[PDB]
Amino acid sequence: PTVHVEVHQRGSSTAKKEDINLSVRKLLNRHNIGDYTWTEFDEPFLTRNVQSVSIIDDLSACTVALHIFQLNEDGPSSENLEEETENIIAANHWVLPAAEFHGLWDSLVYDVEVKSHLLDYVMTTLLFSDKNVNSNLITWNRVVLLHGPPGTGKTSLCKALAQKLTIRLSSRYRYGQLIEINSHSLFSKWFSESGKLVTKMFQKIQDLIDDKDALVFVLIDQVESLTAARNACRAGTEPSDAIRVVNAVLTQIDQIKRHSNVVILTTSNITEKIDVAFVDRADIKQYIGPPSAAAIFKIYLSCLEELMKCQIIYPRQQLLTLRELEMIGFIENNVSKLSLLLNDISRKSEGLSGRVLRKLPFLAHALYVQAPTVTIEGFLQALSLAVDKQFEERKKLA
Amino acid sequence: SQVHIFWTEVILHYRPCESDPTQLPKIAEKAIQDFPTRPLSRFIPWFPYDGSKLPLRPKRSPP
Amino acid sequence: VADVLCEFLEVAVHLILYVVGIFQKRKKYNVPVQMSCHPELNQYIQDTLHCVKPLLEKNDVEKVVVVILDKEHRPVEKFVFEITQPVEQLLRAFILKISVCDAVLDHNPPGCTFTVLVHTMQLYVEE
Amino acid sequence: VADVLCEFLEVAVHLILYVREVYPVGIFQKRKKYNVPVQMSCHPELNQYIQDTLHCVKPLLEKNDVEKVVVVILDKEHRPVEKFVFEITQPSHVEQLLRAFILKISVCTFTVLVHTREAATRNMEKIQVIKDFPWILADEQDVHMHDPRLIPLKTMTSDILKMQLYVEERAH
Numbered sequence: 151p152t153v154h155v156e157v158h159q160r161g162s163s164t165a166k167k168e169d170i171n172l173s174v175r176k177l178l179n180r181h182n183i184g185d186y187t188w189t190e191f192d193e194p195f196l197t198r199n200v201q202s203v204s205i206i207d208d209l210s211a212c213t214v215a216l217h218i219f220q221l222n223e224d225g226p227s228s229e230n231l232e233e234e235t236e237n238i239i240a241a242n243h244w245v246l247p248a249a250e251f252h253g254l255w256d257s258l259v260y261d262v263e264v265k266s267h268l269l270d271y272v273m274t275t276l277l278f279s280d281k282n283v284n285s286n287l288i289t290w291n292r293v294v295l296l297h298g299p300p301g302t303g304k305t306s307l308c309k310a311l312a313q314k315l316t317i318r319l320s321s322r323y324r325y326g327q328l329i330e331i332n333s334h335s336l337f338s339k340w341f342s343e344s345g346k347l348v349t350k351m352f353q354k355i356q357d358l359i360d361d362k363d364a365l366v367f368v369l370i371d372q373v374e375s376l377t378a379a380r381n382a383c384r385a386g387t388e389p390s391d392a393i394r395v396v397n398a399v400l401t402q403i404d405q406i407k408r409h410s411n412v413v414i415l416t417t418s419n420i421t422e423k424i425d426v427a428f429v430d431r432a433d434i435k436q437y438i439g440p441p442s443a444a445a446i447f448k449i450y451l452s453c454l455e456e457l458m459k460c461q462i463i464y465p466r467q468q469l470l471t472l473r474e475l476e477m478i479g480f481i482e483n484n485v486s487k488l489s490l491l492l493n494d495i496s497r498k499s500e501g502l503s504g505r506v507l508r509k510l511p512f513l514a515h516a517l518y519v520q521a522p523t524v525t526i527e528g529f530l531q532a533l534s535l536a537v538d539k540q541f542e543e544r545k546k547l548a
Numbered sequence: 549s550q551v552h553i554f555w556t557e558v559i560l561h562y563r564p565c566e567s568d569p570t571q572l573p574k575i576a577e578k579a580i581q582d583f584p585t586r587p588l589s590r591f592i593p594w595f596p597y598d599g600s601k602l603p604l605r606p607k608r609s610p611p
Numbered sequence: 612v613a614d615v616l617c618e619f620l621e622v623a624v625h626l627i628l629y630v631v632g633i634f635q636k637r638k639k640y641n642v643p644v645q646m647s648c649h650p651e652l653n654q655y656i657q658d659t660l661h662c663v664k665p666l667l668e669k670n671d672v673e674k675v676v677v678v679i680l681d682k683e684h685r686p687v688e689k690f691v692f693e694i695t696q697p698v699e700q701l702l703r704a705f706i707l708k709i710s711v712c713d714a715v716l717d718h719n720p721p722g723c724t725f726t727v728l729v730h731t732m733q734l735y736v737e738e
Numbered sequence: 739v740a741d742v743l744c745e746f747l748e749v750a751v752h753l754i755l756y757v758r759e760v761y762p763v764g765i766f767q768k769r770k771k772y773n774v775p776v777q778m779s780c781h782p783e784l785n786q787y788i789q790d791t792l793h794c795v796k797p798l799l800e801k802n803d804v805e806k807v808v809v810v811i812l813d814k815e816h817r818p819v820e821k822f823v824f825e826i827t828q829p830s831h832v833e834q835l836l837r838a839f840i841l842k843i844s845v846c847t848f849t850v851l852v853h854t855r856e857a858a859t860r861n862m863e864k865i866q867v868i869k870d871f872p873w874i875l876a877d878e879q880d881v882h883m884h885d886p887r888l889i890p891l892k893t894m895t896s897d898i899l900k901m902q903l904y905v906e907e908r909a910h
């Protein structure tokens with residue numbers, strides 16, 4: 151077997167890597183007790199040179215591997231044209247691991263096991279790379295598609311992937327680059343100038359790829375915009391946008407397929423209206439669906455123990471997870487009532503997009519309760535009314 | 549007035565052969581500063597010599 | 612005298628790296644001291660003091676701060692040597708002051724990974 | 739530290755008869771101990787004399803009735819020149835500071851002068867029960883180190899052992 155451990159090193163901490171590894175291994179072997187995360191330490195060095203330690207899926211086993219990472223402080227660099235520096239490309243450039251991305255991989259909650267599939271995909275990619283397999287004989291396009299309902303966190307999973315991969319695979323690539331492509335600023339449309347513009351940003355991608363000691367992730371938002379369905383569209387009125395801008399990207403991406411330290415990640419909204427010659431050039435086209443009842447309950451939990459962690463809900467009552475309610479078998483009791491009422495909200499708040507789910511506490515603490523400090527079961531009631539407030543508001547805008 | 553970091557207008561020192569420590573200059577800053585010293589304790593033996601008491605001497609000598 | 616003071620700073624820096632089996636007794640300045648045989652370290656400390664040498668040719672100097680680092684390079688200990696720079700017992704008296712200092716106090720992990728500093732015979736330790 | 743201190747006094751007494759040449763250099767040899775090259779001896783009479791010394795000195799080490807146990811360089815007429823005082827408050831980290839004392843002895847007849855608050859009578863009778871050699875109370879001329887240089891050679895406030903050693907010696 152194997153288990154993974156990740157430890158936040160402070161930027162103002164500068165001790166050597168192997169000392170950090172030895173110290174964390176010492177803490178683990180002394181403690182050696184589930185998936186909980188350490189925050190409390192007992193060594194002045196380790197305190198001033200560590201922020202937290204965490205286990206990612208209660209056992210005293212010693213099959214432990216350490217990944218140590220530094221979330222880079224500064225945000226995005228910008229990419230503009232070479233001689234038309236005003237606005238032509240304007241691509242976003244994250245130098246991973248990055249600060250604004252942490253905690254993101256944990257918060258997201260799905261029910262189709264996208265995380266494991268879409269992570270061990272890259273793991274098997276590296277395995278086949280190091281074993282020297284005949285790239286002429288077994289190959290992959292290094293393109294992963296994610297499509298589904300709007301606001302359901304489709305694109306969130308790609309930044310989480312990139313963060314988790316530049317963290318997990320440290321000391322195998324010093325760092326990673328993540329290029330966020332704006333598929334709306336590359337449509338300067340007068341007689342195939344956009345189809346010529348894709349070329350420049352892809353040469354810059356080549357520039358960031360040849361640095362063979364950096365793992366690069368190219369994240370394309372709205373991959374339906376760049377690749378419009380040319381065949382079924384019975385519109386000859388499309389002069390050269392539907393034929394000389396999709397064909398200007400189906401080549402530059404078949405050109406980076408030969409390299410190995412690149413991965414293409416794409417986010418789509420419309421399943422149709424996309425070129426059939428691009429739904430073959432993607433290894434994984436995984437569908438991100440709207441949250442389901444258990445998922446909704448887990449997200450609502452995350453929110454509520456987040457509020458309790460910041461003391462918003464001052465009287466701390468144990469919120470019982472759905473597994474404990476199944477174990478007891480749905481028995482009403484003086485503490486078990488709150489979880490039950492949460493679960494009734496979960497069925498009643500079914501079918502909403504994850505973004506409004508992660509908003510709903512904001513509104514429920516906005517209009518219905520002005521209290522700077524709130525007791526539970528009134529805040530819960532505020533949620534149970536704010537959800538119906540959201541249904542009626544959606545019905546209001548027709 | 550000047551401090552050197554053999555790793556105020558500061559004259560650091562680099563010795564390019566050693567250059568594993570990816571971030572050097574911030575390491576160099578730490579080495580310079582002062583920080584709270586503990587007092588140099590004026591020391592005292594705890595069990596002093598009382599002249600009214602006489603110690604023990606065995607007879608034998610080395611060959 | 613600056614040259615022989617720099618050789619005594621050699622004696623200091625490295626014997627205090629001692630004050631384990633990779634170290635050995637040998638005759639330095641007519642006393643036996645248990646240092647290291649490392650020729651790379653020998654010439655490296657010689658280089659430290661001989662780059663300190665033009666520094667003392669300037670004659671403007673305050674301390675020779677032989678910082679005994681921890682393994683973190685973030686001082687949990689230190690050894691400031693504030694000699695107010697303008698027979699064998701006294702050339703050994705300095706070594707006995709530092710030994711009694713590390714006596715009442717304590718050392719650091721085996722590899723002290725120390726980085727000599729200078730601020731341009733007496734001493735103390737910021738622990 | 740009973741074994742540790744015992745072997746330390748062995749290596750000590752050889753360094754003591756070595757460094758100031760009261761005996762010829764060729765008599766003692768060397769081996770390896772405490773990660774330190776140390777000076778040893780194998781001459782029989784001295785070996786057994788020191789043997790009796792150590793297995794007679796261990797119980798003062800355990801019971802702690804001793805303000806300070808001393809090793810004294812003596813002349814052929816019992817004329818002390820250097821006392822080595824163990825001012826000891828005995829109530830993983832200890833042996834390394836004994837490396838430090840080894841260095842210190844390198845840069846610091848004979849007798850085992852045990853300063854106890856009680857009379858040496860119990861210790862004396864004990865010497866003649868773990869040795870044929872009789873122990874006597876130290877006379878006037880074997881204790882007086884006139885003009886003592888009160889320099890503390892090396893102190894250790896270890897949680898296991900409050901130990902401070904120094905040479906009570908004249909101006910020299």
Ligand SMILES: Nc1ncnc2c1ncn2[C@@H]1O[C@H](COP(=O)(O)OP(=O)(O)OP(O)(O)=S)[C@@H](O)[C@H]1O
Nearest residue numbers: 257258259300301302303304305306441504505508
């Ligand atoms: N399924 C989910 N589970 C938990 N949190 C979610 C989920 N989906 C979305 N979120 C939260 O939604 C916020 C942003 O989601 P987005 O990824 O921007 O949605 P999106 O899918 O990008 O929609 P598009 O395609 O860009 S309109 C993040 O803060 C996520 O935490």
